[PDB]
From a paper:
Here, we use cryo‐EM to identify a novel, low‐populated MSA filament subtype (designated Type I2) in addition to a predominant class comprising MSA Type II2 filaments.
Multiple system atrophy (MSA) is a progressive neurodegenerative disease characterized by accumulation of α‐synuclein cross‐β amyloid filaments in the brain. Previous structural studies of these filaments by cryo‐electron microscopy (cryo‐EM) revealed three discrete folds distinct from α‐synuclein filaments associated with other neurodegenerative diseases. The 3.3‐Å resolution structure of the Type I2 filament reveals a fold consisting of two asymmetric protofilaments, one of which adopts a novel structure that is chimeric between two previously reported protofilaments. These results further define MSA‐specific folds of α‐synuclein filaments and have implications for designing MSA diagnostics and therapeutics.
Residue numbers in the entry:
A (entry chain R), B (entry chain P), C (entry chain N), D (entry chain L), E (entry chain Z), F (entry chain V), ...: 36 to 100
L (entry chain E), M (entry chain I), N (entry chain G), O (entry chain S), P (entry chain Q), Q (entry chain O), ...: 14 to 94
The structure:
Amino acid sequence: GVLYVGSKTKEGVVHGVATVAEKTKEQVTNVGGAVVTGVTAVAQKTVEGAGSIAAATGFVKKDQL
Amino acid sequence: GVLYVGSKTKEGVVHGVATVAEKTKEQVTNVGGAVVTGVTAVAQKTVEGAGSIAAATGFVKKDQL
Amino acid sequence: GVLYVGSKTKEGVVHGVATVAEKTKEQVTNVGGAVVTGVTAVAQKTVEGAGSIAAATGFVKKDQL
Amino acid sequence: GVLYVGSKTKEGVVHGVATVAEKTKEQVTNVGGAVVTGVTAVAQKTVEGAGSIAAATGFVKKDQL
Amino acid sequence: GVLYVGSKTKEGVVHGVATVAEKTKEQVTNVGGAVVTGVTAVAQKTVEGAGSIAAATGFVKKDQL
Amino acid sequence: GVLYVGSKTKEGVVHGVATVAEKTKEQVTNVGGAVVTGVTAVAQKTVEGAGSIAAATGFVKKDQL
Amino acid sequence: GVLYVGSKTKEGVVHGVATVAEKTKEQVTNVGGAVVTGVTAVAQKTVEGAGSIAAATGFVKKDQL
Amino acid sequence: GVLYVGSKTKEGVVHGVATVAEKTKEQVTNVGGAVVTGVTAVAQKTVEGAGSIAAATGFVKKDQL
Amino acid sequence: GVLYVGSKTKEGVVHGVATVAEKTKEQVTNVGGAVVTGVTAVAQKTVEGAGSIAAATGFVKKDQL
Amino acid sequence: GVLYVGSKTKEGVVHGVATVAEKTKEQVTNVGGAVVTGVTAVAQKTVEGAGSIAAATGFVKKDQL
Amino acid sequence: GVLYVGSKTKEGVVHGVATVAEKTKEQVTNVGGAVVTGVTAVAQKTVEGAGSIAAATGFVKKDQL
Amino acid sequence: GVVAAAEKTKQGVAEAAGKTKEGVLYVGSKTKEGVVHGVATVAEKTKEQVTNVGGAVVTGVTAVAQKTVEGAGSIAAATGF
Amino acid sequence: GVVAAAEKTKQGVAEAAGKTKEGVLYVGSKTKEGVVHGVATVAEKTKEQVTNVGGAVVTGVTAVAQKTVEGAGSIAAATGF
Amino acid sequence: GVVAAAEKTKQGVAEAAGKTKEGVLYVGSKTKEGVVHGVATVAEKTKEQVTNVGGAVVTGVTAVAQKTVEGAGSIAAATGF
Amino acid sequence: GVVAAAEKTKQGVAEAAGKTKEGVLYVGSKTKEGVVHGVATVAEKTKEQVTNVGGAVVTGVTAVAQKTVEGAGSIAAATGF
Amino acid sequence: GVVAAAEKTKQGVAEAAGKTKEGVLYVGSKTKEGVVHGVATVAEKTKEQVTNVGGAVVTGVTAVAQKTVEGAGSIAAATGF
Amino acid sequence: GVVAAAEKTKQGVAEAAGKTKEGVLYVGSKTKEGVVHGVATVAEKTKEQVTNVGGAVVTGVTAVAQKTVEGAGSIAAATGF
Amino acid sequence: GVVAAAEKTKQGVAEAAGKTKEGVLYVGSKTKEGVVHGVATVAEKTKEQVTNVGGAVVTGVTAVAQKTVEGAGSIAAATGF
Amino acid sequence: GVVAAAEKTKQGVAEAAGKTKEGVLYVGSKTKEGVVHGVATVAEKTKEQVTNVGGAVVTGVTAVAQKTVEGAGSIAAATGF
Amino acid sequence: GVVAAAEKTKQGVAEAAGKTKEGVLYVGSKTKEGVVHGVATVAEKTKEQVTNVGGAVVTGVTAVAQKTVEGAGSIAAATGF
Amino acid sequence: GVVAAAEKTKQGVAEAAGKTKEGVLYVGSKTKEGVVHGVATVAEKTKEQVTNVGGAVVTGVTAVAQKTVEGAGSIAAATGF
Amino acid sequence: GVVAAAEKTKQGVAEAAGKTKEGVLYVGSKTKEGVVHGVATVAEKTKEQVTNVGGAVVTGVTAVAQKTVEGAGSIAAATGF
C-alpha cells in the first residue's frame, strides 16, 4: 500500500563541491610518504568488512603483522 | 498505507562545499608521513566491520600486531 | 496510515562549508607524522564495529598489540 | 495515523561553517606527531562499538596493549 | 493521531560557525604530540560503546594496558 | 492526539559561534603533549558507555591499567 | 490531547559565542601536558556511563589502575 | 501494492564537482611516495570484503605480513 | 503489484564533474612513486572480495607477504 | 505484476565529465613510477574476486609474495 | 506479468566525456615507468576473477611471486 | 618586439605571440529553452472535452520555443473585426 | 617583430605568430529548444473529445520551435472579419 | 619588449606574449529558460472541460521560451474591434 | 619591458606577458528562469471546468521565459475596442 | 620594467607580467529567477471552475521570468476602450 | 621597476607583476528572485471558483521575476477608457 | 621599486607586485529576493471564491521580484478614465 | 622602495608589494529581502470570499521585492479620473 | 622605504608592503529586510470576506522589501480625481 | 623608514608595513529590518470582514522594509481631489 | 623610523608598522529595527470588522522599517482637497 509520488532520496551522496585556486604557488618534496593537495570527493552507501579502510586520503600504512 | 508525496530525505550527504585559494604560497617537505592540504568531502551511509577506519585524512598507521 | 507530504529529513549531513584563503604563506616540514592544513567534510549515518575509527583527521597510530 | 506536512528534521548535521584566512603566515615543523591547522566538519548519526574513536582530529595514539 | 505541520527538530547539530584570521603569524614545532590550530565542528546524535572517545581534538593517548 | 504546528526543538545543538583573530602572534613548542589554539564546536545528543570520553579538547591520557 | 503551536525548546544548547583577539602575543612551551588557548563550545543532551568524562578541556589523566 | 510515480533515488552518488585552477605554479619532487594534486571523484554503492581499501587517494602501503 | 511510472534511480553514479586549468605551470620529477595531477572519476555499484582495492588513485603498494 | 512505464535506472554510471586546459605548461620526468596527468573515467557495475584492484590510476605495485 | 513500456536502463556506462586542450606545452621523459596524459574512458558491467586488475591506468607492476 | 628563446636544452619549446584574441568555448554545456521533462501520471479514468466556437484553444503537454522579430508572437490568438 | 628560436636541443619546437583570432568551439555541448521528453502515463480508461466550429484547436503532446521575421507567429490562431 | 629565455636546461619552455584577450568559457554549465520538470500526479478520476467562445484558452502543462523584438508577445490573446 | 629568464635549471619555465585581459568562465554553473520543478499531487477525484467568452484564460502548470523589446509582454491579454 | 629570474635551480619557474585584468568566474554557482519548486498536495476531491467574460485569467502553478524594454509587462491584462 | 629573483634553490619560483586588477568570483553562490519553494497541503475537499468580468485575475501558486525599463510593470492590470 | 629576492634556499619563492586591486568574492553566499518558502497547511474543507468586475485581483501563494526603471510598478492595478 | 629578502634558508618566501587595495568578500553570507518562511496552518473548515468592483485586491501569502527608479511603486493600486 | 629581511633561518618569511587598504568581509553574516517567519495557526473554522469597491485592499501574510528613488512608494494606494 | 629583520632563527618571520587602512568585518552578525517572527494563534472560530469603498486597507500579518528618496512613502494611502 | 629586530632565536617574529588605521568589526552582533517577535494568542471566538470609506486603515500584526529622504513618511495617510 506504499506510494511514492514525486519523492526524493539521497543516501551516501556528495553534491556540489566547488574549488578555485588562483595564482597559488605550491612546492612539494616527498620521500616515501603521502602528500595530497587536490580535491577528493568520495560517496559510498555500504562498506562492510573487518579491518577495511572505507575512505583514505593521505594515508601511510606500515604495519608489522 | 504509507504515502510519500513530495518528501525528501538525506542520509549521509555532503552538500555545498566551497573553497577558494588566491595567491597562497605553500611549501611542504615530507619524509614518511602524511600531509594533506586539499579539499576532501566524504559521504557514507553505513560502515560496519571491526577495527576498520571509516574515513581517514592525514593518517599514519605503524602498528606492531 | 503514515503520510509524508513535503516533509524533509537530514541524518548525518554536512551542508554549506565555505573557506577562503588569500595570500597565506604556509611552510611545513614533516617527519613521520600527520599534518593537515585543508578542508575535510565527513558525513556518515551509521558506523558500527569494535575498535574502529569512524572519522580521523591528522591521526598518528603506533600501537604495540 | 501519523501525518508529516512540511515537517523538517536534522539529526547529526553540520550546517553553515565559514572560515576566512587573509595574509596569515604559518610555519610548522613536526616529528612523529599530529598538527592540524585546517577546517574539519564531521557529521554522524550513529556510532556504536566498544573502544572506537568516533571523531578524532589531531590525535596521537601510542598504546601498549 | 500525531500530526506534524511545519514542525522543526534539531538533535545533535552544529550550525553557523564563523571564523576569520587576518595577518596572524603562527609558528609551531611539535615532537610526538598533538597541536590543533584550526576549526573543528563535530555533530553527532548517538555514540554508544564502552571506553570509546566520542569526539577528540588535540588528543594524546599513551596507555599501558 | 498530539499536534505540532510550527513547533521547534533543539537538543544537543551548537549554534552561532563567531571568532576573529587579527595580527595575533603565536609561538608553540610542544613535546609529547596537547596544545589547542583553535575553535572546536561539538554537539552531541546521546553518549552512553562506561569509561568513555564524550568530548575531549587538549587531552593527555597516560594510564597504567 | 497535547498541542504545540509555535512552541520552542532548547535542551543542551550552546548559542551565541563571540570571541575577538587583536594583536595578542602568545608564547607556549609544553612538555607532556595540556595547554588550551582557543574557543571550545560543547553541547550535549545525555551522557550516561560510569567513570566517563563528559566534557574535558585541558585535561591530564595519569592513573595507576 | 507499491507505486513509484515520478520518484527519485540517489544511493552512492557524486554530483556536481567544479574546480578551476588559474596560473597556479606547482612543483613536485617525489621519491617512492604518493603525491596527488588533482580531482578524484569516487562513487560506490556496496563494497564488501575483509581488509579491503574501498577508496584510496594518496596511499602508501608497506606492510610486513 | 509494483508500478514504476516515470521513476528514476541512481546507484553508484558520478555525474557532472567540471575542471578548468588555465596557464598553470606544473613540474614533476618522480622516482618509483605515484604522482597524479589529473581528473579521475570512478563509479562502481558492487565490489566484493577480500583484500581488494576498490578504487586507488596515487597508490604505492610494497608489501612483504 | 510489475510494470515499467518510462522508468529510468543508472547503476555504475559516469556521466558528464568536462575538462579544459588552456596554455598549461607541464614537464614530467619519471623513473620507474606512475605519473597520471589526464582524464580517466571508469564505470563498473560488479567486480568480484579476492585481492583484485577494481580501478587503479597512478598505481605502483612492488610486492614480495 | 512484467511489462516494459519505454523503460531505460544503464549498467556500467560512461556517457558524455568532453575534453579540450588549447596551446598546452607538455614534455615527458620516462624510463621504465607509466606516464598517462590522455583521455581514458572504461565502461564494464561484470569483472570476476581472483587477483585481476579490472581497470588500470598508469600502472607499474613489478612483483616477486 | 616579442622574443622567445631556448638554448642548450634536451626538450625545448620556444613560443612567441604578438597579439591574441581567444574565442568562445562550449565544453559539455547544456541549454534548455521551452522544455517539458518528466511528466508522470497514473489515473484510473481520464476524460477531456473541448468545445470551441470561433476561438483558439491549446491544451495538452506543449513546449514552445518561439522567436519573432517584427510580428506579434502568441500561443493562442483570437481576433474578430 | 615576433621571433622564436631553439638551439642545441634534442627535441626543439620554435613557434611564432604575429596576430591570432581564435573562433568558437562546441565540444560535447547540447541545446534543446521546444522539446518534450519523458511523458509517462498509466490510465485504465481514456477519452478525448474535441468539438470545433470555425476555430483552431491544438491538443496532444506538441513541441514547436518556431522562428518568424516579418509575420505573426502563433500556435493556434482564429480570425474573422 | 616582451622577452623570455631558458638556458642550460633539461626541459625548458620559453613563452612570450605581447597582448592577450581571453574569451568566454562554458565548461559543464547548464541553463534553463521556460522549463517544466518533474510533474507527478496520481488521480483515480480525472475530468477536464473547456468551453470557449471567441477567445483564447491555453491549458495543460505548457513551457514557453518566447522572444520578440517589435511585436506584442503573449501566451493567450483575445482582441475584438 | 617585461623580461623572464631561467638558467642552469633541470626543469625551467620562462613566461612573459605584456598585457592581459582575461574573460568570463562558467564552470559547472546553473541558471533557471521561469522553471517549474517537482509538482506532486495525489487526488482521488479531479474536476476542472473553464467557460471562456471573448477573453484569455491560461491555466495548468505553465512556465514562461518571455523577452520583449518594443512590444507589450503578457501571459493572458484581453482587449476590446 | 617587470623582471623575473631564476638561477641554479633544479625546478625553476620565472613568470613576469606587465599589466593584467582578470575577468569573472562562475564556478558552481546557481541562479533562480521566477521558479516554483516542490509543491506537494494531497486532496480527496478537487474542483476548479473559471467563468471568464471579456477578461484575462491566469491560474494554476505558473512561473514567469519576463523582461521588457519599451513595453508594458504584465501577467494578466484586460483593457477596454 | 618590479623585480623578483631566486638563486641557488632546489625549487624556485620568481613571480613579478606590474599592475593587476582582479575580477569577480562566484564560487558556490546561490541567488533566488521570485521563487516559491515547498508548499505542502493536505485537504479532504477543495473548491476554487473564479467569476471574472472584464478584469484581470491571477490565482494559484505563481512566482514572477519581472524586469521593465520604460513600461508599466504589473501582475494583474485592468484599464478602461 | 618593488624588489623580492630569495637566495641559497631549498624551497624558495620570490614574489613582487607593483600595484594591485582585488575584486569581489562570493564564496558560498546566498541571496533571496521575493521568496516564499515552507507553507504547510492541513484543512478538511477548503473553499475559495473570487467575483471580480472590472478590477485586478491577485490571490494565492505569490512571490514577485519586480524591477522597473521609468514605469509604474505594481502587483494589482486598476485604472479607469 | 619596498624590498623583501630571504637568505640561507631551507624554506624561504620573499614577498613584496607596492600598493594594494583589497575588495569585498562574501563568504557564507545570507541575505533575505521580502521573504515569507514557515507558515503552518491547521483548520478544519476554510472559506475565503473576495468581491471586487473596479479596484485592486491582493490576498494570500505574498512576498514582493520591488525596486523602482522613476515610477510609483505599489502592491495594490486603484486610480480613477 | 619598507624593508624586510630574514637570514640564516630554517623556515623564513620576509614580507614587505608599502601601502595597503583592506576591504569589506562578510563571513557568515545574515540580513533580513521585510521578512515573515514562523506563523503558526490552529483554527477549527476560518472565514475571510473582502468587499472592495474602487479601492485597494491588501490582506493575508505579506512581506514587502520596496525601494523607490523618484516615485511614491506604497503598499495599498487609492486615488481619485 | 619601516625596517624588520630576523637573524639566526629556526622559524623566523620578518613583516614590515608602511601604511595600512583596515576595513569592515561582519563575522556572524545578524540584522533585521521590518520582520515578523513567531506569531502563534489558537482560535476555535475566526471571522474577518473588510468593507472598503474608495480607500486603502492593509490587514493581516505584514512586514515592510521600505526605502524612498524623493517620494512619499506609506503603507496605506488614500487621496482624493 | 620604525625598526624591529629579533636575533639568535629559535622562534622569532619581527613586526614593524609605520602608520595604522583599524576599521570596524561586527563579530556576532545583532540589530533589530521594526520587529515583532513572539505574539501568542488563544481565543475561542474571534471577530474583526473593518468598514472604511475614503480613508486609510492598517490593522493586524505589522512591522515597518521605513526610511525616507525628501518625502513624507507615514503608515496610514488620508488626504483630501
